[PDB]
From a paper:
Avapritinib is the only potent and selective inhibitor approved for the treatment of D842V-mutant gastrointestinal stromal tumors (GIST), the most common primary mutation of the platelet-derived growth factor receptor α (PDGFRA).
Intense screening and optimization resulted in two complex structures with avapritinib in wt and gatekeeper-mutant KIT-T670I. Additionally, the introduced hydrophobic isoleucine is close to the polar scaffold, presumably contributing to a reduced binding affinity.
Author numbering: 566 to 693, 763 to 818, 821 to 825, 829 to 931
């Protein structure tokens, strides 16, 4: 074996990302968990030497096991190897010298798309405030980012509206690459997002390009239901797993177009080989928007 796939996590950390820790001033906490948190912060001199810049900083608590500490470094290396993309919460810098590792990423002023839809749900119109054309753009942008991930042999493993952020110009970005993996055939694997997971992920812990496509289909349902929870009225229990295995699927949300719901049904196919690729999803949605 003289040819091998270059493992992004095995590559050395590039010190081009290194940013002085004392030049960050922390603000409100954006997200919190048992392992760590993400805070809004001000970076002085990050892009321009004399200009302060609003950023988000992902950090672990000192009471963190070594597996979580290297998971944060692995996410940092994935984001650097992946490269910049418009539909990704892009890496801006890192603070690895001595102190606790800090990962500086883009700040999205509007927050997660799930909470955004629930705010705008009361004042939504299909045609003339959130509109239908916004929903089509959001599904198109997230598909491009996922297609970009899949084009780098990478899976996200936690695709959902809560992990899609909105920023200026109605640009959506995929965030939280903590569970992102480089598949090169599939990846086999904590609390899991069962209602977004493909059946093969629930039953055999297998994660693929196709399992991301399943989660994308669940995301489209979140999108066109104006932020409702998936499988409403069904708790994650023994009956839930049985109905999924047998072929139960959510019906079309109220505002979903027929060709958008058609994508959801192909995303939710029991056979992964019959699920569409993200590249196919982009062209389908792209044709839709021009015809719109
Ligand atoms: C008006 N408004 C604006 C925002 C907003 C919110 C973000 C954001 N996210 C915040 C939420 N996220 C996130 N991710 C991972 C975790 C953890 C708990 N699992 C974690 C944390 C650290 C760690 F070391 C390991 C795990 C928590 N929270 C994703 C990023 N990023 C950028 N801008 N932004 C802007 C929210 N309201």
């Amino acid at each position: 074996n003289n040819y091998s796939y270059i493992d992004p996590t095995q590559l050395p950390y590039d010190h081009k990302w290194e940013f002085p820790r004392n030049r960050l001033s922390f603000g409100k906490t954006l997200g919190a968990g048992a392992f760590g948190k993400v805070v809004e912060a001000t970076a002085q001199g990050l892009i321009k030497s004399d200009a302060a810049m609003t950023v988000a900083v992902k950090m672990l608590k000192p009471s963190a096991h070594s597996t979580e500490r290297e998971a944060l470094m692995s996410e940092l290396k994935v984001l650097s190897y992946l490269g910049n993309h418009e539909n990704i919460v892009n890496l801006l810098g890192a603070c690895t010298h001595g102190g606790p590792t800090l990962v500086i990423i883009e700040y999205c002023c509007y927050g997660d798309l799930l909470n955004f839809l629930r705010r705008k749900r009361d004042e939504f119109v299909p045609y003339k405030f959130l509109t239908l054309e916004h929903l089509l753009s959001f599904s198109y942008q997230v598909a491009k980012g996922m297609a970009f991930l899949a084009s780098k042999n990478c899976i996200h493993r936690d695709l959902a509206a809560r992990n899609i952020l909105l920023t200026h110009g109605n640009i959506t970005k995929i965030c939280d690459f903590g569970l992102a993996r480089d598949i090169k055939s599939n990846y086999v694997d904590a609390r899991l997002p069962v209602k977004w997971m493909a059946p093969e992920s629930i039953f055999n812990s297998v994660y693929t390009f196709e399992s991301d496509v399943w989660s994308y289909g669940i995301f489209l349902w979140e999108l066109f239901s104006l932020g409702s929870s998936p499988y409403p009225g069904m708790p994650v229990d023994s009956k839930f797993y049985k109905m999924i295995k047998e072929g139960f699927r959510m019906s079309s949300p109220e505002y979903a177009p027929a060709e958008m719901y058609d994508i959801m049904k192909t995303c939710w196919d029991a056979d992964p080989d019959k699920r569409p690729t993200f590249k196919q999803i982009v062209q389908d949605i792209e044709k839709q928007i021009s015809e719109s």
